[PDB]
């Protein structure tokens, strides 16, 4: 920018999207990466492998295509994250993928966070992924219990649109149950 000697960062470094030091360490495993990414409204999970001209996504799942199986609730929460990971993991199993390493990009390794929920989901789908149980949220929170108890302090419905008043972690069970089922159109 300033002259011939000036050093411009790699594109994905300028864009502040890729941590190259972390990426290298991730790629050292030789295993595919379980790319956990969040959005204000959604949660995405991708099984990415290394390629000659760029990364290859062999399987993925977005919290939006969760409804295709019977999801009527919001898509930016814990239950949403787990289910999106499970869905991605199941699609991964179908593609011949057996193992992966969790890539959380620029997100923080906070205990009980959504990226670990995505991780738990993928693991339950059948994927062997290096993990740590006491960094994952306790089962109830993954179900969405923390949100129901929050709506218990009602007076005004937590959800604007009508999914339900007191919310349903039971809906989470129905969906998980639907995915763990052998049939399911992946």
């Amino acid at each position: 920018a300033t002259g011939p000697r000036y050093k411009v960062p790699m594109r994905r470094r300028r864009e502040a999207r890729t941590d190259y030091h972390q990426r290298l360490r991730l790629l050292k495993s030789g295993k595919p990466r379980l790319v956990a990414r969040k959005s204000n409204k959604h949660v995405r999970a991708q099984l990415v492998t290394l390629g000659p001209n760029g990364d290859d996504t062999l399987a993925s799942a977005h919290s939006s295509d969760l409804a295709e199986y019977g999801w009527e609730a919001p898509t930016g929460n814990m239950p949403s994250a787990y289910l999106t990971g499970l869905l991605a993991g199941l699609r991964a199993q179908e593609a011949g993928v057996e193992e992966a390493v969790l890539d959380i990009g620029l997100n923080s390794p906070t205990p009980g966070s959504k990226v670990f929920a995505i991780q738990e989901g993928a693991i339950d789908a059948g994927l062997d992924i290096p993990h740590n149980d006491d960094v994952l949220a306790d089962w109830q929170r993954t179900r969405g219990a923390h949100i129901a108890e929050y709506d218990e302090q009602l007076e005004e419905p937590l959800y604007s649109g009508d999914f339900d008043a007191a919310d349903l972690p039971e809906h989470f069970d129905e969906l998980r149950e639907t995915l763990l089922d052998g049939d399911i159109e992946l």
Binding site: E15, A16, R17, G105, L106, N107, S108
Partner: protein, 140 residues
């Protein structure tokens, strides 16, 4: 167009650069929350050789804690034109700094895909003077 352009107060940093403390107490009572010790860099002949060591204290106020402070803080000073920053800030007074900005400032403060706020979307001294002056006081 206007709603996402009208200024706001991001933080009010009240600090007392002493030089060696017992002053934390007053900042706590005048602000409403806990103070923070302030270390220093580089050795100085004025018996300030110790690198990392208490010298001052500060408090960063946000939202109500900031407004509820300024309501009784601003009336204690005579704001001037020169007393204003180029980004639209101002410091008066025990120091009291007020950081002003527009709605989408988080774009430059977040971890993922951060970006620096374009000059057009940056606050101006004039635009700052107006907003504050337009709230219980006078300019010049």
């Amino acid at each position: 167009f206007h709603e996402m352009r009208e200024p706001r107060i991001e933080k009010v940093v009240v600090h007392m650069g002493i030089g060696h403390a017992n002053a934390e107490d007053i900042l706590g009572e005048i602000t409403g929350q806990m103070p923070v010790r302030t270390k220093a860099k580089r050795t100085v002949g004025e018996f300030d050789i110790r690198e990392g060591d208490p010298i001052g204290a500060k408090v960063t106020l946000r939202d109500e804690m900031a407004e509820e402070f300024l309501q009784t803080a601003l009336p204690l000073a005579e704001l001037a034109t020169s007393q204003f920053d180029d980004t639209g800030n101002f410091s008066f007074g025990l120091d009291v700094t007020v950081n002003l900005v527009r709605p989408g400032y988080r774009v430059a403060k977040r971890d993922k895909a951060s970006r620096s706020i374009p000059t057009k979307h940056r606050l101006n001294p004039a635009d700052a003077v107006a907003f504050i002056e337009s709230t219980y006081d006078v300019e010049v």
